[PDB]
Amino acid sequence: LVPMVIEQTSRGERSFDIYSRLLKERVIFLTGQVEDHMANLIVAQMLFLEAENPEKDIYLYINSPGGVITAGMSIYDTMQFIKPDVSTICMGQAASMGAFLLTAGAKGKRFCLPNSRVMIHQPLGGYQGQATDIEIHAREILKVKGRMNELMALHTGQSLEQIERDTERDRFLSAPEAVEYGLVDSILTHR
Amino acid sequence: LVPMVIEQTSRGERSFDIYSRLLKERVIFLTGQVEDHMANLIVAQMLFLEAENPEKDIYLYINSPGGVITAGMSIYDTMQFIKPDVSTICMGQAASMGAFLLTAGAKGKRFCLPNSRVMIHQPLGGYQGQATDIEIHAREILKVKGRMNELMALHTGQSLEQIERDTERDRFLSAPEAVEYGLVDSILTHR
Amino acid sequence: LVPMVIEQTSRGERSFDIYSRLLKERVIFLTGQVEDHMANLIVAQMLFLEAENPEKDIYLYINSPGGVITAGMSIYDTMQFIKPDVSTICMGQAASMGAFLLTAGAKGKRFCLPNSRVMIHQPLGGYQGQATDIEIHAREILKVKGRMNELMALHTGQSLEQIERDTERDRFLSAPEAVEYGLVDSILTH
Amino acid sequence: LVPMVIEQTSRGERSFDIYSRLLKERVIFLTGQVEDHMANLIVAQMLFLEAENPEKDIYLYINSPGGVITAGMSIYDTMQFIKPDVSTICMGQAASMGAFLLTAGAKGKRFCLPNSRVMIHQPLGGYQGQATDIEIHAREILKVKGRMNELMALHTGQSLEQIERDTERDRFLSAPEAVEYGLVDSILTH
Amino acid sequence: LVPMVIEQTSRGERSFDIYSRLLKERVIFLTGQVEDHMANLIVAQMLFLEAENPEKDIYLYINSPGGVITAGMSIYDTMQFIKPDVSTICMGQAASMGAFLLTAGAKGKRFCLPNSRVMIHQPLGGYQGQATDIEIHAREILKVKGRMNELMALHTGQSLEQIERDTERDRFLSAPEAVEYGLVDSILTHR
Amino acid sequence: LVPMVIEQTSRGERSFDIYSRLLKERVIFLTGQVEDHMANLIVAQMLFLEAENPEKDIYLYINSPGGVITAGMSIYDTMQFIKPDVSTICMGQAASMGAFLLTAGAKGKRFCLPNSRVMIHQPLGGYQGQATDIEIHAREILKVKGRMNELMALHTGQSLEQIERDTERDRFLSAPEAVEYGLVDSILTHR
Amino acid sequence: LVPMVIEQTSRGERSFDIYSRLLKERVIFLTGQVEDHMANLIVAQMLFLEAENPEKDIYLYINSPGGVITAGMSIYDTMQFIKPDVSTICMGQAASMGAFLLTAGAKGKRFCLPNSRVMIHQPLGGYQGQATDIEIHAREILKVKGRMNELMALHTGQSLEQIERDTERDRFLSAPEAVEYGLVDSILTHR
Amino acid sequence: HPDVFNILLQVMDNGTLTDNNGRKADFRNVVLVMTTNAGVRETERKSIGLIHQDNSTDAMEEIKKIFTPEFRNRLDNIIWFDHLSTDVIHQVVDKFIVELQVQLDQKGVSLEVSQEARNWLAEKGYDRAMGARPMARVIQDNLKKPLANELLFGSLVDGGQVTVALDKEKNELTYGFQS
Amino acid sequence: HPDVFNILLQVMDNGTLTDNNGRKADFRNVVLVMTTNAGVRETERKSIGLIHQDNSTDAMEEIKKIFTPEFRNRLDNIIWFDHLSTDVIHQVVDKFIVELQVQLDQKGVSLEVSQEARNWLAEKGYDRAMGARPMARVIQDNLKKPLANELLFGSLVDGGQVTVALDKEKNELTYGFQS
Amino acid sequence: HPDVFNILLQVMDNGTLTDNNGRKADFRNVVLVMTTNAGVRETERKSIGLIHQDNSTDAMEEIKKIFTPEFRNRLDNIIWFDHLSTDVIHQVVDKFIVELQVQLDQKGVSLEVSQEARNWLAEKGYDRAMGARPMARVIQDNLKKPLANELLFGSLVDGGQVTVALDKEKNELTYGFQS
């Protein structure tokens, strides 16, 4: 169950759930495997915050073990498109398409906890059928592979060649090592 | 659970859901697999928005992996029937039915994000029974398949032969490759 | 989830589900396979609207891929003994019971969309057990089949021999063909 | 999701369910397999209606395919015990127990739809175990059949010999044929 | 779903479910198989009504097909402990446990519908394990059987030997037969 | 379903749940197999009542068939921690953990219904895998057994040797017999 | 079903559930297997309390059997990040990543109940596939193990060698043993 | 509102109520009468269930929860009214007709209402839920409306000789006018 | 506001309205009438349905809801004004033209209005919700606004003999000017 | 209102209360007394459960919630009044009888009531929840009501000498008017 917290205001007292109270403060929670349904809530939340105040920064706590590549792009595209800087914090764990959103945050507003861990790998998928159909499906994986590395390279600032060689296999980067790689600007020891 | 949001109306404060609040601003989300129940809900939203302000144009965000074609057709007919222009902004992914609704949007208002990926194919259907039943049943499969081509050409503007050959097998059209094909006018980056 | 909507009444603002608002305007929604559960909800909506204002007309949309004969028949009987004309519109797809309930509306009020796909076939059922029980059970469904063709011929106006022949097997009727067949009229887009 | 109708009252606007609003108009719906919880729910509604107005007749629709016989008796005995005359409008399939409730309605107030189908059969039950145990249960089910046959004849008015004769084998009766058997008074005129 | 019923009050209308409205009139409902959870709800209602009016009699409808004997003691003990006399009305059928609670009502207030049934039989509890453990558990079930027979004799008025004979094997007692056996004073036809 | 109950508060009408109303009167209900989640809920009720009125005494109705041993210790520790005497009543049945909590009540406030039952058995558990790990786990089960017997002896008053010999095999103690064993102070037939 | 409670205030009466009412007094319940979803509630609750009062001490009742190690670290990072001292209490059992959060409390505020049992062991995980992939994933669990021993050494105060030695296999540390091994400062029997 | 009930507490015990200006409202001579329909619902409505409980004391119990004990204690007595009987209602119809008869008798118009009309007005005019309040309304629409129109113009202006009657075929009230 | 309705209920029952000053006012010889523009929104409300052809035609029900049942009992009968017909609107247009003609007589300027011109004014000046209210503004903008421009300078300064016509294709009013 | 209790703070501690014009009042020779029935409902409340719990503590706990600590700290003492016992009612009946004799002494009538009547009258009006106010009503209903009819017209108009006694068989009081 989700607890209910009271928000004291001059007009009076209002009751909101624990998640809704933080949402009012521009704090969004990206928890669980990435999916179309959970992505719609994250996208809807970003649009609501933009209209309320398009100048304040938006914070996104990312604790996800990875998920659907198509759903993540929906969140990533909205983060860049909107004017507010979508700050990202890696709480607990970051994986493929969970870490991509972490680096997607605006420069100078990306952080990681001292004991947080982040991993990245190439898109994993498969198809079964005739050889003709497998050709088209296989080509899509290569197209997204090149595009995904181009985006991570644009945000991290590493060479495109570096990402493909390093992202061919799972790479476990600790919180301090993430700063050297370029995924995040620093560790969130304090403001 | 969906979060709650507060609207600072002149009369007073009112609590709304993340989807209900966006619905008040003429925004519909086509999330999840296409189905009769989910599609029926979208129809209800379109009719409600039409009566509220027929002059204003409705906005729809297409994000789904596709589904049953029979249920999806109900959205197509309702979209053209209502006077408000049904803008279609593909978010994340557009399937055969999702793309079919994407093209249905009014000319000049359709959009696609920079990293959005579109996909189109032919209807997949099967039937089991006596040989005589498959013949009459299969006839409708070809009619609906061919019928969708004419509707696609009306909005896309491409030749019938071009859509027939491409629709024969799976075809993945990225965001820039989709504007050139004619499915959409341009990507939504700035205004 | 069902999105909520606000109605600006004279007294003040009122919040209720999207289906509840459309129900206020006498717009009933039929979706999914028909069953004994949703049937009562559809009939309940007709009975409540009738008591509120029987002079006005009720609307019903058909987006079902089939269903039980006994369950769908309950909605058919409701439209008969009520003064409000139950308008029938086919959204997306119709079936054996969807088409029957679609053509059961008052003549002229029934409409249809351009891309609607209709399907009509005889009732399908089976019983297993003792031969004596199968005889009465098998003999009973034939009477229902003839009853369906009889009532369907009334609203449509087609001959009983023609409607039963086409309904003997799977028959698909598109929106233009349906108008010629006499099942439904065309929606007034203007 | 059940709709949420709105009611216009001088005190203010109130939100009710479709089933709950109908309960104000003495309209009760019955559907699905008879169950202990389902039967107690119908019984609870009957008791409330009696206290509200013991003179105004109650309406009870029936669209169930039959269920346990024991739980069904709780609805029957309750209908007889309460002073209001509970009409029975069979809107769909009515099995043995479903039909028993239809017959239990007040004389001159029972009704049925023209396309409604009602089938009555002897109570069907099974039991397994030791030879002595099956004998006890076997005797009990026969006693229940006698009670159901005896009460059916009283309400319908048909001779007990005819009731027990046809009930042995599965029987399907249409709405017009029901008037001949005395099961229902007459179909709805409009 | 449970229907809602409105009761008119001086200040404003109050909405209550059909089960709670009847509870206000001292009408409890015992439906379904007996269990530690449902029994806890029945005793809770009894204690609540006692505080409201310790003089008015409670009405406990019984339409249960039987259940665990452990949970039944909670209802039986609660009925005897509270000062108000509980009126037990057999609706539909009364199994061994249901019949026990039925006869457990105060003398002169126990009734059964003319078409209701009343079944009584020995407990069917079974245990498995080592021979030593079976002997311990086997001796316990006999005590419960004897205890139930003794309690039934007090309420029904029959001798312990008579209850043992009738409870040795399953037996179905019709509504009129229940009056002869001594479980209830008479049928509920007039009040 | 949970029936609602109206409370005639001095301020005005107030609607409460069947369990919420009883909780206001310091009456807590323990039902079902002991578990971490339900045990936490019981602990929460005890702590809340402590600050409301520490002078008064809390009541607990135990009707559980036994469950997890770890969760049960949290309830016992909280009962002894808080100043209010947590009276315990055995409704229907009390298992090993249920009986351990029943006897844990303060002296002079433990009661049991006449037809109630009690049972005490040694902790049951098993481990599978490496032999060394089984040895660590094996000592733990035995260590927990000695802890319960040591604590049960203090509350009941019997010697630890007596508890250990009797608890080797499950023993069912009726309400009269239970008072002789020291688990309960007196029967609740009348005060 | 969580019971509801009333909070009497000068402005009026506020109805809150039991869990939310305790949250109002800086009490967070960590019960059940550690997961990414439940972790957000604990993290969101800690942040909500810091805003209300960044000086008062938060309390965390750990009654969980352990779970995902990476998910639990999000709570530990937040515990040390926020200025408030997150006091920890052990209810029932404590396992891997449950005990780590129990010992992460500030010095002088960590406590355990007299009967609470603590269990400490190294992380357990398994991965199957290519030998190269297994080696990469193997280094992670080994690296996390070293970080866990280093972090636990700081709080408990034992050397990394000694904690590493005990963590090779399961070690059930009782309440007195835990105080001896530095897991907690003292017990709550008398405070 | 409860705030209003509090004002009445001092009124019954002390007989005085202070105002904004400080003037003491000494009104110990005024008699205080209150009208409420709180317990009538329980009296007419039977208890839900197969068995009917004793509702004799249920009406008084409702007054104990609605009104606070201090308020009820200050009351001198509670006057429980009883529902009108079949014979009592018939006399009410005569009372209203007497006011109309005497009102028109001075004007010179005689009124002779038939017994059948009196009985019909009773049932329609007296509702159990709303009481006999609609009697004045139905009497106005049924009798005052037609007679008033003909009073200014027509034979009814003088001579009177008005005789009302009711027809069994349609149950309507017939009118008679003469010079 | 709700308190305002109670002020009317008191006079309808007792017929005398008290004043704080102490003056006694009697409504025995004062006729009271009130208008309510309710139900027009419900009728003009666009239906949420797909066809949008749903008509309410039950505006009387809304009137009873906006008012409390108590107020309805005091009033003996309510007046209802039916929607006007297009033919009746033509007479309203002539009323404004007559006033304009009288105003122009002081300057010696005539005004001729064609039968086709009146049709344009009637449709433009009649609204379903507002009725004849726009007619004042529509007549002024169409007829008086251009007139003043020519009357200030042009042939219409003297001589009069004004003429008005409308083109059939575009349906726009053109006024000929004569010296 | 709870905010009104703050005015009495300085009155109970500082001993003065300034007015709008700055005049300082003196409460040093004033005895301040407050009456409340907050904890009454909580005490009489019947607990739900098998084991009855003593609710005497709820009397003071409710008072603490109504009055802040600063308000109660200034109070010299909080005296809790207890329900009147049966023995106290006997003395209360004598008080009302004496008060009734003072009312009759003005007219000249003298009332003498036997001890047996007092005991029967006490039991009839003995209500623990209502304290002693009901004793007024039984005296009024049993003694004053029969006397009012005689004092106005009858033997008790002049002379009095009223005797009240109860006969065990009837179990009702007897009144003897001796003028």
Author numbering:
A (entry chain K), B (entry chain L), E (entry chain H), F (entry chain I), G (entry chain J): 2 to 192
C (entry chain M), D (entry chain N): 2 to 191
H (entry chain E), I (entry chain F), J (entry chain D): 570 to 748
Task: Give excerpts from the publication.
In two classes, the NTE is bound by a spiral of pore-1 and pore-2 loops in a manner similar to substrate-polypeptide binding by many AAA+ unfoldases. In classes I and II, residues 2–15 of the ClpS NTE were built into density in the D2 portion of the channel, but this NTE region was not visible in class III, presumably as a consequence of its conformational heterogeneity. The register of this ClpS peptide is very similar in each structure, with the C-terminal portion of the NTE (Pro24–Pro25–Ser26) near the top of the ClpA channel, and the N-terminal portion near the bottom of the channel in classes I and II. In classes II and III, the relative height of ClpA subunits was A (highest) > B > C > D > E > F (lowest), whereas in class-I, subunit B was higher than subunit A, resulting in a shallower spiral when aligned to the bottom of the IGL loop and the two flanking ClpP subunits. For example, the D2 GYVG pore-1 loops of all six ClpA subunits contacted the ClpS NTE in classes I and IIc, albeit the D2 pore-1 loop of subunit A had a lower buried surface area (BSA) in class I than in IIc. The presence of 11 engaged pore-1 loops (five D1 and six D2) probably contributes to the high affinity of ClpAPS•N-degron complexes assembled in ATPγS13. For example, in class IIc, the BSA values for the D1 KYR loops range from 63 to 196 Å2, the D1 pore-2 loops from 40 to 156 Å2 and the D2 GYVG pore-1 loops from 101 to 179 Å2. In contrast, the D2 pore-2 loops only weakly contact the NTE, as the BSA values of these interactions range from 20 to 74 Å2.
ClpAP, a two-ring AAA+ protease, degrades N-end-rule proteins bound by the ClpS adaptor. AAA+ proteases, such as ClpAP, consist of a hexameric AAA+ unfoldase (for example, ClpA6) and a self-compartmentalized peptidase (for example, ClpP14). Each ClpA subunit has two AAA+ modules, called D1 and D2, that associate in the hexamer to form two stacked rings. Here we present high-resolution cryo-EM structures of Escherichia coli ClpAPS complexes, showing how ClpA pore loops interact with the ClpS N-terminal extension (NTE), which is normally intrinsically disordered.
